[PDB]
Amino acid sequence: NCDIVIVGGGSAGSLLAARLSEDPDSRVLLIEAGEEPTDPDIWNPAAWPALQGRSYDWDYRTEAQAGTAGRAHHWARGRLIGGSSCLHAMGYMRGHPSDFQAWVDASGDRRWGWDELLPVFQAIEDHPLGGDGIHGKGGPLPIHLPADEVSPLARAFIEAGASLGLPRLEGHNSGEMIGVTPNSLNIRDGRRVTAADAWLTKAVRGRKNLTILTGSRVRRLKLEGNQVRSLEVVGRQGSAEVFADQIVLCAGALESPALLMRSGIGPHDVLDAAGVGCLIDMPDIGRNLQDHLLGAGNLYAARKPVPPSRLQHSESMAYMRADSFTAAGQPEIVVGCGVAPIVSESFPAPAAGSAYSLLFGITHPTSRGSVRISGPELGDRLIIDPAYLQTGRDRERFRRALEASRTIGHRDELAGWRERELLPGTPNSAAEMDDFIARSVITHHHPCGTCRMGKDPDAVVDANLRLKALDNLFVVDASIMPNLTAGPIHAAVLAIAETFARQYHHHHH
Amino acid sequence: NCDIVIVGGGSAGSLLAARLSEDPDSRVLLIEAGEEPTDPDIWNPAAWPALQGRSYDWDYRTEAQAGTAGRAHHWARGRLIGGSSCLHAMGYMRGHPSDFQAWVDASGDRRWGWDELLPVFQAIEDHPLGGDGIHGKGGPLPIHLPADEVSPLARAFIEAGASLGLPRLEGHNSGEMIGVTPNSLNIRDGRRVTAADAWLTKAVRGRKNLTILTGSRVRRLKLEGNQVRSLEVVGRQGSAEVFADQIVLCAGALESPALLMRSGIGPHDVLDAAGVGCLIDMPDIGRNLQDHLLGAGNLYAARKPVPPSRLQHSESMAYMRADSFTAAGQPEIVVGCGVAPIVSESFPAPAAGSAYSLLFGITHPTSRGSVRISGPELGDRLIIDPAYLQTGRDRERFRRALEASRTIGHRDELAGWRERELLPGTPNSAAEMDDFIARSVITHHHPCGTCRMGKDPDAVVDANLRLKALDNLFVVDASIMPNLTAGPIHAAVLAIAETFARQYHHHHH
Numbered sequence A, B: 001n002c003d004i005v006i007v008g009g010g011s012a013g014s015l016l017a018a019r020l021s022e023d024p025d026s027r028v029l030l031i032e033a034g035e036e037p038t039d040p041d042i043w044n045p046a047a048w049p050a051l052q053g054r055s056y057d058w059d060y061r062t063e064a065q066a067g068t069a070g071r072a073h074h075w076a077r078g079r080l081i082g083g084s085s086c087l088h089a090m091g092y093m094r095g096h097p098s099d100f101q102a103w104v105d106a107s108g109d110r111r112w113g114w115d116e117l118l119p120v121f122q123a124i125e126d127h128p129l130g131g132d133g134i135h136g137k138g139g140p141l142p143i144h145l146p147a148d149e150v151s152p153l154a155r156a157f158i159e160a161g162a163s164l165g166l167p168r169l170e171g172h173n174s175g176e177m178i179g180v181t182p183n184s185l186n187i188r189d190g191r192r193v194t195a196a197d198a199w200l201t202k203a204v205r206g207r208k209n210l211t212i213l214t215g216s217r218v219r220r221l222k223l224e225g226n227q228v229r230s231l232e233v234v235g236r237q238g239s240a241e242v243f244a245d246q247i248v249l250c251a252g253a254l255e256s257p258a259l260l261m262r263s264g265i266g267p268h269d270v271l272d273a274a275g276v277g278c279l280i281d282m283p284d285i286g287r288n289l290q291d292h293l294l295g296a297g298n299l300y301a302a303r304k305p306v307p308p309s310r311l312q313h314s315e316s317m318a319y320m321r322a323d324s325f326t327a328a329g330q331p332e333i334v335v336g337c338g339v340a341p342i343v344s345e346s347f348p349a350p351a352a353g354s355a356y357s358l359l360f361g362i363t364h365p366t367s368r369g370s371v372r373i374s375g376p377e378l379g380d381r382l383i384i385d386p387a388y389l390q391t392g393r394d395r396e397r398f399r400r401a402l403e404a405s406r407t408i409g410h411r412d413e414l415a416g417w418r419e420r421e422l423l424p425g426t427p428n429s430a431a432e433m434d435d436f437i438a439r440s441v442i443t444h445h446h447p448c449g450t451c452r453m454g455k456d457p458d459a460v461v462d463a464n465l466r467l468k469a470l471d472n473l474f475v476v477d478a479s480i481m482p483n484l485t486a487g488p489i490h491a492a493v494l495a496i497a498e499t500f501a502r503q504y505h506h507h508h509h
Ligand SMILES: Cc1cc2nc3c(=O)[nH]c(=O)nc-3n(C[C@H](O)[C@H](O)[C@H](O)COP(=O)(O)OP(=O)(O)OC[C@H]3O[C@@H](n4cnc5c(N)ncnc54)[C@H](O)[C@@H]3O)c2cc1C
Pocket: A007, A008, A009, A010, A011, A012, A013, A031, A032, A033, A034, A052, A076, A077, A078, A079, A080, A081, A082, A083, A084, A085, A087, A088, A089, A090, A091, A092, A093, A216, A217, A218, A219, A250, A251, A252, A253, A255, A256, A259, A444, A445, A446, A447, A477, A478, A479, A487, A488, A489, A490, A491, A493
């Protein structure tokens, strides 16, 4: 019998399959819904917005969002070995130490603090500042600090921000995140590196104690007593039952609580509505959904042609406080330089090369949404409501983000690039700004929180990532995050899986 | 002062004048030796062999070639806006990915690899397969895939090759070059399209920051310190001095190293012999000259009249390995179907309509020749020795090419066209084959390599196309190619200029 089954071979799942199978005494099975990657374009960094909407994208549609001008949103997730890492903008941001302090407060466990995560991040990273005592050296995930390849537009953006008082950082990962810098990227020798590339190497896949099962979707967990006894797996040509001593869920922010709910584990009323028998009433499963938004966008017509970028198109995020460009601390808002004229569907697209967008957002939304299954079946669509822009705090912070973006946008340092502002123009009121923001915001693609880790009775998992009501079931992916990190969450997801991997090797047999 | 002077308005120069002047902050001067095109016949695709030997052709004469039965050869180059593109057989072949791999090995820079050149080619091309993720869409250079206009002879040729195992391709540009297909052509609405037509549009020529100076020959570059300070330009009614911050050489495979040598930059001994003072001893300038040859030809008497072709007369190149019609990979030899009885001057011409030639060649000659000035003046003839057929490898490969041609030529699929083989007949020995090949080969018109890009100390330019000994001087044309591509080199030349154009917009002010 396999000692451990991992469900979902995305970011967290790939790390786990590799790290757990390092113990030759433990048999590991990885079950992944998608196929093995065959698309060449996904290893081309500049083709990243061009692969969602394709075969290996799950492509969800949220409920209409009252906070975003009644707009419904498309959430793209990866369905292949590598998960969302094969689709991602490949930016690497650990987050800010204060982001993780709130995890310690929520979990009651210092292992989720910056100080304890430091060696964890280090184990993950192969970073050119390795030796720092801060950044990792020799880890499987390459971190690349762009310098020469940074587009001239992005450099002018960086100068604009620096001149307002933002300090110059080397990447966002030293523990200091407020400031001005090119985003660090998971790139090596010009080619993007996925979590699957980094951990699921030829050598790893060759291990006898590791089995990878692709094209295979886990439909239900089967319970006996206080334990998961088996998994029903649906494959191309039939379903089958897999037995395991320990089960780790890595299906991501949407698919993990979905699998739980299909299995009879979740809010009783939701399960009833979906026609699923309730075996374990867990009211928080699917709740506390969080995501970052980006206003698309503070659009500027360009004085000269904008090139299609030597990198990943969103080259530089400037995190900052909402009220000052000089103040330090935990970020509150962000403005990013987009070397593509990125706009939501509420706006006509400008001819390519003719314009660029400053993207603006808030780093720690207080809005909280939910996901729920609509039926027992795999193909029954999830009901996703991220509750975008529902709180006054989120709306107000968003106004400051927009203002900050326009302030950076109109700097002399960008006068070589800027012909004029196309969007928003000049709103005369909070109402008009709110309306522009509502029409412009799009997902930053960081859903998380739906199986929240916490020390309170109704949290979904405890500090050890164990589902509270059962004894051999863990959730180890974005779904457990008590709160969003300031920026992109891939690194935090990887850190979650690595601390779980360590915890596992630490206690078992 | 002009920020940039471009020398030579041929293929590379036209692209550069257009692309660089897109930055309205940079003043661009294009200096072209020829006049503006006035000859109507050069926009008639079937008149292409009829315009060389005319007013706007430079018409060089090589040294007698010991490897080609002591024959001297005529090299025709364009002298007009558009350069060699106004004279060309208008075939479009990117080359094979392995061709460019050797550029990466020579330059030490991945930007010269197929993967990096892919978007470059894409930016250039307006191709009916655009959307591919391979072929370009919307670019200034139209690529036409002939179908209905392909002559019946060429179709029979294609069938002949297909029946031996060659796969059917749609053009040569997907990354797969071995196989059978009509050549793709730079044609739109029946009319040929030059590089000048494509990039130097009315709108482009109307820009205030672009000056085009025709009838003007650059005689010398003037040096101060490690920089070019000015150019001596010779016009119809006198000479004059032009100042510039940056100088880009686009004078082509012969005229670029010539201008360098006249300027005191080149092999010290060669400059002495030509009576030019040596300011910078650069031994490789003028060396590593490469060119493709075509045997003219494997001549067949026709069973019925051969029409003067609805296209460009050489409609179909079949690239292949030398030892098998079924093997894939990088080409080694080529056989092309000529809907004209093309023969070298060593053979009497057959009456028009009475015969056709299969043209045969090797794709990657290992022979290396040289160009050198014979004096300081513009009208002092270049000494050109391409060293045709000097290596045993080139001679041996050529025998396989001839054999392949005769094998295709005698196929049942061509029995409707073939009356009998006129040339070579049947040689009984390697010696007799070598002699026939030596008398029959003519230039394919792809000279290149004379200012070779490389990472070694004595290369002429570095990976960035900057002349190694100076700080503001670039060479951006066929002269920089480390090696020939498998087929015609226009696309590669255009790719060279486009990656330079991108590199320029990327770093300056
Ligand atoms: C377009 C896009 C761009 C992004 N860019 C960035 C970025 O630039 N920087 C950053 O930090 N983050 C980025 N992210 C977010 C980051 O990629 C994700 O947060 C991270 O990959 C989450 O990892 P995960 O393990 O929680 O889930 P995933 O990586 O999504 O993995 C879940 C896996 O489980 C599989 N699965 C799901 N259900 C089942 C089932 N029932 N049975 C079997 N298998 C199943 C899925 O097919 C998938 O492989 C981006 C996300 C997207 C969509």
